[PDB]
Design a protein around this ligand. Structure first.
Ligand SMILES: [Zn+2]
Lengths: 282, 191, 159, 70, 286, 94
């Protein structure tokens, strides 16, 4: 018996169920169960996620047994592997009671996993997901992980400061997480932002189109007005004092490319679709 | 104490609307439901009861469940109107019991048939061997005019438990509200 | 099990390959290292097409990672220095979405092109070096150049 | 990759920042702001902000911990 | 009327997982679950969904089962956990909807005012928009149909939310994408559009040759309605329509002309800018 | 009859086919439009009655045949003309 370089296998539904639950209960720690499968001594796999009511102490486990039952009879039976909750705008660190449920859980199952989530620090590009694993204190001097591979040591990331200020190595150990993707969900997830041929065959309008070009050309004239004075101006001031006196209201040479780009991309497609609609049709 | 799942096929067809039984076939088959639900109740609370009709759109009024009070609530205002339908009754009772959460329970079925059926013996042999695959021993207690001496039903049963199976059985429908405790005096555990 | 094939690596022992196969088909993580390496190692240069079909056919349905890794190296080693028939497998492995099997194919093109100074594979190998998303098959991508540059070793430090 | 870079910087705000006021800038990407917390500070700025939004002490936001013009 | 619905990306995955659940049978096991949505407007919103046991034989498609008990308990749990959520309809993983599919809606029209169906496609070989939904009506016909009952196509779309866009689009990093690709998404648009046109034409001609000869019903269903489709067919090249194009196309050409005009000069500035710094730093360097 | 090539028929063919006088064809066509089986229009300086809309009628096998001819003749043009697009831009849209 010894630790390893463990891996956290996920379920794509699990992530969304996380973020929607925590976001909906954003002003407080929202709790829930992590349901999955113990694939081996090395890696874990979560496939199902769900939560319960909380007014953090969960109420009647009669929801528990009936929930897992009806989840077994429809679909199949599975195994509870861990759990999760939120640290809204927090250091995604196991709170004092959060660790207090951990001696409760690891005593039940060995590889009981805590799951920290914050729907606050997560930007649309990247989410701040987290999960931890309690460690004993009796072995505070004795080694805890054999470290037989670089992956969970010098191959992952670097512990953050706001959670290292709480445990960072102590009272628990971090764990790596990845994403397994079925090809079935993968293909449909690939395509969810395309439209039908109607969109690709629309001709927006030439009254508001020509009205629009008539718009942008107008102020673009003024942008050229400013651009003449600015470019010819050229105080011999060194290439950085210009970069300190340009903060303000100064903006030639910037809008000029922009309006040209937009006026390009409009007129181009606007002509092209009209072309196709006549070549192809009749 | 045995594990099973009772599936009853009540008859709300038109031909149940008569008095070959003393009060009415509705009260007769209803009371037989009273004795079957108490029977399985006293046998094993783990066992579960589900009912089905034989009307145009044969209905699962109660999903297979150990409680019987719901079935008793369903028995009232049963509205025995329509036409007796058999081959789709054993079918809807057939594909239903594969939706069971508990699989140790043996798929059992009892049917209350009290209207003239129009089935075929090749149909009862196909359905019979189909009931050989899952071994759904069904004991039907007929309540009213069913067929010529319950023909195509002892053939259905024997073609169900062929080669000395004797698990399914066929009752009779000529005198009245047979005390099913007397009908299953010896076959009290398995009719 | 891991060194079993490295010892019998030039002999091409079909006999050890046999029991190594059923060792590989245990559907486990502890035996994945047991068979996954020596299986191809005892078939180095063998080009046993049934061996390729076994390895790639089994590294599509598993659940562990070591059973993916030992196959990732065995499939890259089963073909040795061909440069002309391994192309179909290099494309088959690079077009994959497997974050390990692409990198498995990335190692492959290195061994199928052992030091190959062909400026053909350098285009798309060192192209998926650019557009590649997985860091694993990216590092395995850039780490095939020296494995394909003994013909002109002075060029690696320039690219 | 650069466009992926701009978006990932966005996590810094997350809303609860502080309401302060821009005061002045010393040089490129570093300025001075007097917060509504009564005190005044010397801070850096994000490269995302357009430099045309300055002048006459604009209403600005700042990080709680860092206290940077975001 | 509902006239359109907004389905979120969670569902269309919370169905795929369950098709995966009983997906071991392989041959055929139609996945049916409960659809959950919002009484938003005439337009309707769809947020949640869940499963329910369902089986059906091969012949005589009248033998199918939806556990009303399981539906009652599990939706009781989903109401206890979310009163904001509520039942709106249902779905099935059928690639093409079946003749049996009307009896299901007709059954559970008692829970929802109209339990709208939802057809999803696990394998949309078509690269268009999958997972379209219908809502049944009655269209009693001159023929003498006692109840001409058939579903109705209703336009739908994919929902969106701040958090779910975050988590999903962070997951989209596994593949490359050019969503900011200037004047590229358009070209892709007309490509996929014309592809849909050709697909539809090949389909309608497949049907049309079949009905034309040998064996197919020759009903008055479409046969002249699609003729009226031929009725429009604008005769592009004619007298004054030329004045439609040449009086505007050159207009947009003028704007494009000016844009290129300034773009060239702007590009020309940097030549002076760098040709100054190069040699001026060189001569001072030496 | 005419496939909308020159469907702005003049009064004369109406007065001959319906064999009504010329001064009544206007009152007849205005009645037909009042009914709504057609959406034509009326000129008097030339007395040409333009046709726009015809009610969809029943047809038969051969109409299905020429209809399939139009369908193929148009579909092939659509596909090939998209092939012109892809051919014109291969590595341009990525
Ligand atoms: Zn906490």
């Amino acid at each position: 018996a010894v630790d390893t370089a463990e891996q956290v296998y996920i379920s794509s539904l699990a992530l969304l169920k996380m973020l929607k639950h925590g976001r909906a209960g954003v002003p407080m720690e929202v709790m829930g169960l992590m349901l999955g499968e113990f694939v081996d001594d090395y890696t874990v796999r979560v496939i199902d996620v769900f939560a319960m009511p909380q007014s953090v102490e969960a109420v009647d486990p009669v929801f528990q047994a009936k929930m897992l039952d009806m989840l077994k009879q429809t679909g199949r039976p599975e195994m509870v592997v861990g759990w999760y909750h939120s640290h809204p705008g927090f250091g995604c660190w196991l709170s004092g009671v959060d660790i207090n449920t951990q001696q409760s859980f690891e005593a039940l199952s060995e590889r009981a996993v805590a799951v920290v989530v914050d729907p606050i620090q997560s930007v649309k590009g990247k989410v701040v997901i987290d999960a931890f694993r309690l460690i004993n204190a009796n072995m505070m001097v004795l080694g805890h992980e054999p470290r037989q591979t670089t992956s969970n040591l010098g191959h992952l990331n670097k512990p953050s400061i706001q959670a290292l200020i709480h445990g960072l190595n102590r009272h628990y150990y971090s764990i790596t997480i990845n994403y397994r993707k079925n090809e079935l969900e993968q293909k449909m997830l690939l395509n969810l932002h395309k439209k039908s041929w109607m969109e690709g065959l629309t001709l927006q309008d030439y009254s508001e189109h020509c009205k629009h070009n008539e718009s942008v050309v107008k102020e673009m004239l003024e942008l050229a007005k400013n651009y003449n004075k600015a470019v010819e101006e050229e105080d011999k001031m060194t290439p950085e004092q210009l970069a300190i006196k340009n903060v303000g209201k100064q903006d030639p040479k910037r809008h000029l490319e922009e309006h040209v780009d937009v006026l390009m991309t409009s007129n181009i497609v606007q002509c092209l679709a009209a072309m196709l609609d006549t070549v192809v049709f009749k | 104490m045995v594990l099973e799942s009772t599936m009853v096929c009540v008859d709300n067809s038109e031909y149940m609307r008569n008095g070959d039984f003393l009060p009415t076939r509705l009260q007769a088959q209803q009371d037989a439901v009273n004795i079957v639900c108490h029977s399985k109740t006293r046998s094993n609370p783990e066992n579960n009861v589900g009912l089905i009709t034989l009307a145009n759109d044969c209905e699962v009024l109660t999903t297979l469940t150990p409680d019987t009070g719901r079935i008793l609530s369903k028995l009232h205002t049963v509205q025995p109107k329509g036409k007796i339908t058999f081959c789709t009754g054993i079918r809807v009772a057939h594909l239903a019991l594969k939706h069971r959460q508990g699989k140790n329970h043996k798929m059992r079925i009892i049917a209350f048939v009290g209207s003239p059926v129009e089935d075929n013996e090749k149909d009862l042999v196909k359905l019979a061997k189909r009931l050989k695959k899952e071994k759904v021993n069904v004991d039907i207690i007929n309540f009213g005019e069913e067929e010529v001496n319950t023909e195509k039903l002892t053939a259905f049963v024997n073609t169900l438990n062929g080669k000395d199976g004797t698990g399914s059985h066929l009752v009779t429908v000529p005198p009245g509200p047979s005390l099913a405790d007397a009908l299953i005096s010896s076959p009290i555990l398995a009719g | 099990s891991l060194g079993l094939g490295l010892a019998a690596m030039g002999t091409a022992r079909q006999d050890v390959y046999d029991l190594l196969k059923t060792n590989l088909y245990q559907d486990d993580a502890v035996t994945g290292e047991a068979a996954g390496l020596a299986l191809g190692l005892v078939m180095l240069g063998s080009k046993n097409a049934q061996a390729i079909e076994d390895m790639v056919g089994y590294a599509q349905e598993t659940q562990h990672e070591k059973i993916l890794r030992g196959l990732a190296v065995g499939i890259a080693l089963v073909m040795y220095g061909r440069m002309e028939e391994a192309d179909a497998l290099i494309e088959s492995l690079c077009r994959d979405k497997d974050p390990i099997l692409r990198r498995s194919g990335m190692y492959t093109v290195a061994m199928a092109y052992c030091g190959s100074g062909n400026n053909k594979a350098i285009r798309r190998l060192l192209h998926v070096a650019v557009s590649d998303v997985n860091d694993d098959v990216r590092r395995a991508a850039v780490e095939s150049l020296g494995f394909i540059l003994f013909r002109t070793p002075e060029q690696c430090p320039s690219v | 990759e650069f466009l992926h870079a701009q978006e990932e910087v966005k996590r810094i705000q997350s809303i609860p920042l502080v309401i302060g006021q821009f005061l002045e800038a010393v040089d490129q990407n570093t300025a001075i702001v007097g917060s509504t917390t009564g005190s005044n500070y010397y801070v850096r700025i994000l490269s995302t902000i357009d430099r045309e939004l300055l002048k006459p002490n604009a209403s600005v936001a700042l990080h709680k911990h860092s206290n940077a013009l975001v | 009327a509902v006239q359109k619905v907004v389905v979120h990306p969670l569902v269309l995955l919370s169905v795929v997982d369950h098709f995966n659940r009983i997906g071991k049978v392989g041959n055929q096991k139609r996945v049916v679950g409960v659809l959950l949505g919002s009484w938003q407007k005439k337009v309707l919103d769809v947020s949640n969904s869940f499963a329910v046991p369902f089986d059906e034989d091969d012949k005589d498609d009248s033998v199918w089962f939806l556990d009303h008990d399981y539906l009652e308990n599990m939706y009781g749990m989903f109401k206890k956990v979310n009163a904001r959520e509520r039942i709106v309809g249902w779905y099935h993983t059928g690639p093409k909807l079946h003749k049996n599919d009307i009896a299901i809606n007709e059954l559970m029209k008692r829970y929802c005012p109209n339990s709208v169906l939802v057809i999803i496609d696990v394998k949309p070989k078509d690269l268009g928009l999958p997972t379209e939904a219908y809502i049944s009506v009655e269209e009693v016909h001159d023929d003498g149909t006692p109840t001409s009952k058939t579903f109705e196509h209703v336009t739908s779309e994919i929902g969106a939310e701040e958090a779910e866009e975050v988590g999903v689009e962070h997951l989209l990093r596994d593949i490359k994408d050019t969503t900011v690709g200037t004047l590229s998404q358009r070209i892709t648009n007309q490509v996929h559009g014309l592809k849909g046109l050709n697909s539809k034409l090949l389909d309608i001609r497949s049907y049309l040759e079949k009905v034309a000869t040998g064996k197919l019903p020759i009903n008055h269903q479409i046969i002249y309605q699609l003729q009226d489709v031929f009725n429009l067919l604008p005769d592009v090249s004619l007298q004054e329509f030329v004045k439609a194009f040449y009086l505007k196309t050159n207009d947009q050409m003028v704007v494009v002309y000016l844009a290129s005009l300034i773009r060239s000069v702007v590009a020309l500035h940097n030549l002076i800018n760098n040709k100054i710094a190069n040699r001026d730093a060189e001569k001072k360097e030496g | 009859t005419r496939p909308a090539n020159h469907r702005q028929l003049t009064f004369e063919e109406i007065a001959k086919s319906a064999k009504i006088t010329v001064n009544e064809v206007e009152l007849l066509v205005m009645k037909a439009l009042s009914v709504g089986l057609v959406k034509g229009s009326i000129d008097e300086v030339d007395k040409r009655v333009h046709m726009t809309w015809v009610q969809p009628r029943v047809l038969d096998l051969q109409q299905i045949k020429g209809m399939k001819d139009r369908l193929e003749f148009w579909c092939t043009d659509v596909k090939s003309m998209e092939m012109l697009v892809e051919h014109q831009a291969h590595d341009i849209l990525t």
